[PDB]
Amino acid sequence: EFDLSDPLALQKELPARISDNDMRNTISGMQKFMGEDLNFQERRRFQKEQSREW
Amino acid sequence: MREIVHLQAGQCGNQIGAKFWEVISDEHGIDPTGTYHGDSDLQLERINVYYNEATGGKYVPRAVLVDLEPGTMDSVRSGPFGQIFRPDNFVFGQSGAGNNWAKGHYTEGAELVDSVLDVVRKEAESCDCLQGFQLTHSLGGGTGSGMGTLLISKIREEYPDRIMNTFSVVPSPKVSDTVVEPYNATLSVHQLVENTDETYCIDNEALYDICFRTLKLTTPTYGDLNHLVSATMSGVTTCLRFPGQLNADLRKLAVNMVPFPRLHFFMPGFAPLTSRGSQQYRALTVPELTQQMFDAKNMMAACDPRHGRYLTVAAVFRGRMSMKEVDEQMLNVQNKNSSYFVEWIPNNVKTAVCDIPPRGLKMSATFIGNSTAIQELFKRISEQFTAMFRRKAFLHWYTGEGMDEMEFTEAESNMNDLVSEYQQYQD
Amino acid sequence: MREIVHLQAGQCGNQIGAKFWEVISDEHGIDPTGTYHGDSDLQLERINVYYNEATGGKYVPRAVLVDLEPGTMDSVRSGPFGQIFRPDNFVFGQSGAGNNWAKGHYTEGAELVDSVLDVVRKEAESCDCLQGFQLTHSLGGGTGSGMGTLLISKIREEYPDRIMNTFSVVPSPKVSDTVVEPYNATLSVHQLVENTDETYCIDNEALYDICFRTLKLTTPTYGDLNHLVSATMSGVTTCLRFPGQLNADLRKLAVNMVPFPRLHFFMPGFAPLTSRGSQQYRALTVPELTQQMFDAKNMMAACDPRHGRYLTVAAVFRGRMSMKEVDEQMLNVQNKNSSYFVEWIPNNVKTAVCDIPPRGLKMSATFIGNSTAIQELFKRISEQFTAMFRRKAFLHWYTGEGMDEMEFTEAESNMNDLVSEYQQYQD
Amino acid sequence: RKNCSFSTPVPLSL
Amino acid sequence: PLDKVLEQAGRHSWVDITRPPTPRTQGLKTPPPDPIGTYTPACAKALFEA
Amino acid sequence: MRECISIHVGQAGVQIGNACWELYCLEHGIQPDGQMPSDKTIGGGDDSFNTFFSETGAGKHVPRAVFVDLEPTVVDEVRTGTYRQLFHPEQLITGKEDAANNYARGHYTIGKEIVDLVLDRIRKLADLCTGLQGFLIFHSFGGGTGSGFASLLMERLSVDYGKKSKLEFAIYPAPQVSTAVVEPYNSILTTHTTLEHSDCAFMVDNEAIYDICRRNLDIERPTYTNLNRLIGQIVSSITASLRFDGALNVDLTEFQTNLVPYPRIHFPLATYAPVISAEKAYHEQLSVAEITNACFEPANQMVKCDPRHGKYMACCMLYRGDVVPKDVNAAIATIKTKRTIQFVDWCPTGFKVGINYQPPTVVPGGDLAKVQRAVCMLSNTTAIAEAWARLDHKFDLMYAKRAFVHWYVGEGMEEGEFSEAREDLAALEKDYEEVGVD
Amino acid sequence: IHLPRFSLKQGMIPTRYVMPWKENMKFRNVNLQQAEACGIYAGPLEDSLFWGYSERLCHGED
Ligand SMILES: Nc1nc2c(ncn2[C@@H]2O[C@H](COP(=O)(O)OP(=O)(O)OP(=O)(O)O)[C@@H](O)[C@H]2O)c(=O)[nH]1
Numbered sequence A: 001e002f003d004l005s006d007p008l009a010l011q012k013e014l015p016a017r018i019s020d021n022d023m024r025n026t027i028s029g030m031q032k033f034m035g036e037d038l039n040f041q042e043r044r045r046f047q048k049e050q051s052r053e054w
Numbered sequence B, C: 001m002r003e004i005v006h007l008q009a010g011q012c013g014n015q016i017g018a019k020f021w022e023v024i025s026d027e028h029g030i031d032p033t034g035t036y037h038g039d040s041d042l043q044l045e046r047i048n049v050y051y052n053e054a055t056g057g058k059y060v061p062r063a064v065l066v067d068l069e070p071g072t073m074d075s076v077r078s079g080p081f082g083q084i085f086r087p088d089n090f091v092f093g094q095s096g097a098g099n100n101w102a103k104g105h106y107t108e109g110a111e112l113v114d115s116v117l118d119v120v121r122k123e124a125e126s127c128d129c130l131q132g133f134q135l136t137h138s139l140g141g142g143t144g145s146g147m148g149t150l151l152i153s154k155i156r157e158e159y160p161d162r163i164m165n166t167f168s169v170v171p172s173p174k175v176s177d178t179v180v181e182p183y184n185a186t187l188s189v190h191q192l193v194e195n196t197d198e199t200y201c202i203d204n205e206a207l208y209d210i211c212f213r214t215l216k217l218t219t220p221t222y223g224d225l226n227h228l229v230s231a232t233m234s235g236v237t238t239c240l241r242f243p244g245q246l247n248a249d250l251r252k253l254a255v256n257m258v259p260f261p262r263l264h265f266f267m268p269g270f271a272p273l274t275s276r277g278s279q280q281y282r283a284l285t286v287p288e289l290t291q292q293m294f295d296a297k298n299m300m301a302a303c304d305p306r307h308g309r310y311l312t313v314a315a316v317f318r319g320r321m322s323m324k325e326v327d328e329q330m331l332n333v334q335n336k337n338s339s340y341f342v343e344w345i346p347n348n349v350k351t352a353v354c355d356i357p358p359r360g361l362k363m364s365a366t367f368i369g370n371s372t373a374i375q376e377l378f379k380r381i382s383e384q385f386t387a388m389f390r391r392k393a394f395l396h397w398y399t400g401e402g403m404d405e406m407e408f409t410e411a412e413s414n415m416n417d418l419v420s421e422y423q424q425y426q427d
Numbered sequence D: 001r002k003n004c005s006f007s008t009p010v011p012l013s014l
Numbered sequence E: 001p002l003d004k005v006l007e008q009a010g011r012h013s014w015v016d017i018t019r020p021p022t023p024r025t026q027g028l029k030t031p032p033p034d035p036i037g038t039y040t041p042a043c044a045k046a047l048f049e050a
Numbered sequence F: 001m002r003e004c005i006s007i008h009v010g011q012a013g014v015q016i017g018n019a020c021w022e023l024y025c026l027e028h029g030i031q032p033d034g035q036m037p038s039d040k041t042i043g044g045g046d047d048s049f050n051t052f053f054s055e056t057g058a059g060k061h062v063p064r065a066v067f068v069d070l071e072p073t074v075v076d077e078v079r080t081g082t083y084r085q086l087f088h089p090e091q092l093i094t095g096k097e098d099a100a101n102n103y104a105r106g107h108y109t110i111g112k113e114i115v116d117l118v119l120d121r122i123r124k125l126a127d128l129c130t131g132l133q134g135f136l137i138f139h140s141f142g143g144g145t146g147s148g149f150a151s152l153l154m155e156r157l158s159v160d161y162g163k164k165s166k167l168e169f170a171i172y173p174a175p176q177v178s179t180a181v182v183e184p185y186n187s188i189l190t191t192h193t194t195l196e197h198s199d200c201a202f203m204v205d206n207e208a209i210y211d212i213c214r215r216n217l218d219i220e221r222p223t224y225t226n227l228n229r230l231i232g233q234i235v236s237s238i239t240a241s242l243r244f245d246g247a248l249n250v251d252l253t254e255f256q257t258n259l260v261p262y263p264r265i266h267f268p269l270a271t272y273a274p275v276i277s278a279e280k281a282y283h284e285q286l287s288v289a290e291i292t293n294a295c296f297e298p299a300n301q302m303v304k305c306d307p308r309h310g311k312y313m314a315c316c317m318l319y320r321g322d323v324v325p326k327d328v329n330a331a332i333a334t335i336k337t338k339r340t341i342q343f344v345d346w347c348p349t350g351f352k353v354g355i356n357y358q359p360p361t362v363v364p365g366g367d368l369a370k371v372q373r374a375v376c377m378l379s380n381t382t383a384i385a386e387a388w389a390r391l392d393h394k395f396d397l398m399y400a401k402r403a404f405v406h407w408y409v410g411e412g413m414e415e416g417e418f419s420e421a422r423e424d425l426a427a428l429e430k431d432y433e434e435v436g437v438d
Numbered sequence G: 001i002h003l004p005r006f007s008l009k010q011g012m013i014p015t016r017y018v019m020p021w022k023e024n025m026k027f028r029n030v031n032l033q034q035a036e037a038c039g040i041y042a043g044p045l046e047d048s049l050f051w052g053y054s055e056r057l058c059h060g061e062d
């Protein structure tokens, strides 16, 4: 198991959060959360939409 | 083989257990419908400590849901995972709670205690050998305390040889919503200390502070809080489920956790909590885990143990680690604050490493703690109790229920006895 | 390995630190995005002295920006390199300075010192071993001096075994804009000499004269002035991170610089400054560097040391040089003006040679000086204090703040002690 | 909308 | 700044423990042994046995 | 013939053991199936394995060991490992309940029901065995299940079988690292129980094992796999005289007779000299002299005792590989001339030399060095009493403030036995001091 | 039997209090000896000065 702490292990460091659309990030992962709000701006956009028509 | 059955009590536990179970199901790869997707052999091996085998590879949750208001169960039953839940496990009453502790403890419980006892012993006979049980409820909740205090009292005697895990949330110090809640809290906690061996204390305000601190998403749901606390509850349970050279038994933990019986209140602690850009700005290393792992801001349970002293500390590490980094980090933290622990015991650290990373991240950990910070908690409930009982505010309900002030006299004396119990060891 | 963490203090220091960090980033060849382009091995080797390594070949700066007014950090954030700075390090308050020393020293800092201590110790725990710290601020700055006196004190008891390097700019002697600045300067400088060990003295007017003398470009920007001080502050720091037979430790230098504890104030000096046509008119030779190095038109710190004598002199040469040139140049200057040194110490020269040239020019140098030319500085500030304390003008604010006239009494006496101390040692 | 279906007991299940 | 205060406070020979405090040097004597004031008796012993 | 039996109590004692046969199976060329190549080595079980494995007419090398455990997790995963076919199914004794780090739980609650079954294994192993010089006991002092169960089994095997050797091997408690505060409880409990019955108890401490890794092996991040590797070649070296011959062969009986000076104390210290990284072996040279200097260098010992703070009684060196009588005898003669090393005035000679022709081999996918000449240093000194001295002031306080006693008395124990162990210990230091006095 | 007795109502009083005499650990024991060396008050284990927006005296609910 040569790896352990290799001298260049950072080059081998793969983030857990390369992007929001990543396969490994599942529900059991706290990094993938659900109260996180990309919808916040979407709420903002549609709050403007609804308010106007209201 | 040794397994666990869960109890979902109180209307909070209705959200608590619901989120708690679905995290487990999503962790182990079972569909909402129930037909398990065979994907991981190891989680295929040890599901029987919590779930039984039904027809066609459906893994039934072994928990019993009890409440009074049907609407809560209906939403729980009609939730994303109520179909995996059993109406066999749905026991309830046909009366209104009123959020009265005595009603659920003397009036409403009396005709439901027989029914729930029959259900649980049937589930007890369904399984072979248990470690014990665990309970999602609250100390300040009308039904949950009322049913919980009843059930903890009864479950003590028939199986006096198992693990009586308890999980209760402490209401917000700034506002309790319910004004008789401190009466309900004092009534519940008086019996709680007499029965329980393990207890988790959780506060909503700190979770909101954590939301302000690392979540940084302004507006979460209470379910989002449920998701956080479930992960802590999941993390402690990952010990038993998963392989790796870590000693998982709560009794293995309990003997290392508490030196004297009266210490049953234990506080949680969790590992990497991250913000918007910092997921890709974090060098995920055991040091920075450990630094964040021991942060006064990383605390969520009751209040800052900066005020008090550290009696026993136990951190379980989930992921691909090694015995040495945790060893030196244990040295580093020991040298960092050698005085900040109690001189009563040296080497008060208990470490475990789970080699199986969670599903979504690799480097993770959980903490269970017992420090001298709970004095802030029951001091608050004390002078609360003083002011109301001094002029017996909100009392005719319980006398109408048949409750007398003498019951409270030993309740406060028992609590104030525990007040002496902490410091005189500590100071 | 030993490293350094920087503090970006005051509203000028925010301005200054932005330039100093981008100069370092450009010197090492990191893009403004953060993806280091591997070009020089030696700068690849010795960046950990200042920058920690983030994910993806990113070298996170180990500096902390602090202020009160939201205008600055956003402009700093919206700069070409604000993306490289961490919002974790962006700590600030929600009040207006009023350019008040006491507010920054007693009122506003008090609820902010707690957080900044946490930030630095988190950064301190992130590192292993430090030489010390360096701070950028101004002596007459309302918040920089207000917090700086606080912050230097806190790190004094926290780590009394490190480098309390300070980088401060004295305001214009002819006029100071801030009328309470001499009160701010005199109060702040009192605590500095107690706590500081190194002090760089920089004056704006000399930079304008340097702009008049060698820049010759009429209208620069203030950042261009920051370019100069960043180049100089980088130049002194070139010793540590570059190879070549020069002993770089500030302690190595300080023991060569400080014969007595009260010697804290040191003046900078720099090497070839070139005008419009002189770039293609200059034959770069160690003699003409040395002459221009010891030019009365080359100074930028305070004033002419012609009025006094020279206590200690130390110039670090950056580029492809050798002893035989510096030796004779060192001999020549001693033969040039032997009497202008003090008879107390002979051979007051300390020489270090950095073999690694800068990026753009080959032969360069920096100078740090101890000459009896600071008396004019604090005797100047002396009459101002008396000229404003005889009728206690502009004093009602600080009494409302909680300042009493006695605090002034010992403070000025402390500088008055320095007046004799500098005078008596030389005269 | 509350799916008031499970609430029905056997005598009152419709 | 300890250096200035100790000499400006009055008493020149601060006893230096060993150094004989000259009968003239004793100036501002510390307040009588008192716990409430900033002369709690615990310190008073320490100097004596020192 | 010339054989012995291995017993592994506790999940601490198993992974270290699992490495041993993983190591052992290589030098014999054992295939994971349990069968040799087409080469003819099978029989009734009589070849190099006959002392180690049982490759009878069935043709399957059956290890002569019983793993005893209380938790199915770790024992089952190795029953799903790579050599699980080799291992006899019920030899790998497990349990469904733990001792919860309690000595008494495994010693009283669960010990009675389990020991008979392994005693059944013991005698069925005993009946097939022929010479069975002794046993190989691998345990741990800070044993959650190792401590209590090892003591009880050692009681029953001692009472029924008292005429052979009992070889004990446990990880010594870390002097400054404690993963459990109940560890001092059962550790001294184990020691006082084991003093009057154990034949030869050998300890080791993992901290110094780690210290070597980044010293000369240059590994800042080793593992159990490496940790079990280093202790694994240690027991391989002591068993080299068994598997291979040499200029002279030595046996456990000679070890016990020559090592232990006086009753009670039978606790020597092991060391392995040619510990070095891969390349560090390459551009350098190995000979007897430097390794003879290295073997006695104080920082190469795995127990946190300064040899100058003690005095030597016994020292046994086991040379495995290509060595000659000439260099070694002069080298040790120069050693006897050394002044800093302080053997007790009692013994003019205190050295037991074992010469084995066979060079130690590397393991495929390993991290050891390329050793041609190796030596194992089993030594006993008086610098060891500090370890128990460390434990007693650790124990005397916590017993006076009687932490966690409510568990032990709550499960049915009392304080008199805890009272016994301390003067059982307190005798041990004063006895170590009286003998330490010449 | 002793009972808590507080003062009247204020407006800018804080809810909570810290009392570093009993809220210091670095010098925890040290401040303890002077608690009786002066004898101000130890009394009940669990006292504060500000219960919630309320004043009292030094004698903790006695
Ligand atoms: N489910 C749920 N419970 C909450 C929430 N916020 C606070 N709680 C508290 O959790 C406590 C425990 O719930 P229960 O024990 O079921 O309460 P109860 O017995 O029905 O009586 P009540 O306190 O009136 O609800 C409640 O008293 C609430 O104060 C929330 O968002 N969801």
Ligand SMILES: Nc1nc2c(ncn2[C@@H]2O[C@H](COP(=O)(O)OP(=O)(O)OP(=O)(O)O)[C@@H](O)[C@H]2O)c(=O)[nH]1
Pocket: C009, C010, C011, C012, C013, C015, C097, C098, C099, C100, C104, C137, C138, C140, C141, C142, C143, C144, C145, C146, C171, C177, C178, C204, C222
């Ligand atoms: N931004 C900026 N500051 C300057 C400039 N020239 C001089 N300064 C001075 O740098 C000093 C240090 O800034 P700070 O320490 O942050 O000042 P402060 O505490 O916020 O209060 P003030 O000094 O009154 O601004 C200021 O007092 C300015 O007078 C300039 O060109 N730009």
Ligand SMILES: Nc1nc2c(ncn2[C@@H]2O[C@H](COP(=O)(O)OP(=O)(O)OP(=O)(O)O)[C@@H](O)[C@H]2O)c(=O)[nH]1
Pocket: B245, B247, B252, F009, F010, F011, F012, F013, F014, F015, F016, F071, F098, F099, F100, F101, F139, F140, F142, F143, F144, F145, F146, F147, F171, F179, F224
């Ligand atoms: N021998 C050995 N010890 C280990 C290993 N890894 C860790 N240890 C140490 O050995 C100790 C194991 O003792 P115990 O935990 O009491 O083992 P046990 O009694 O068999 O039962 P458990 O408590 O379930 O492990 C731990 O405290 C570790 O410090 C290992 O691989 N081998």
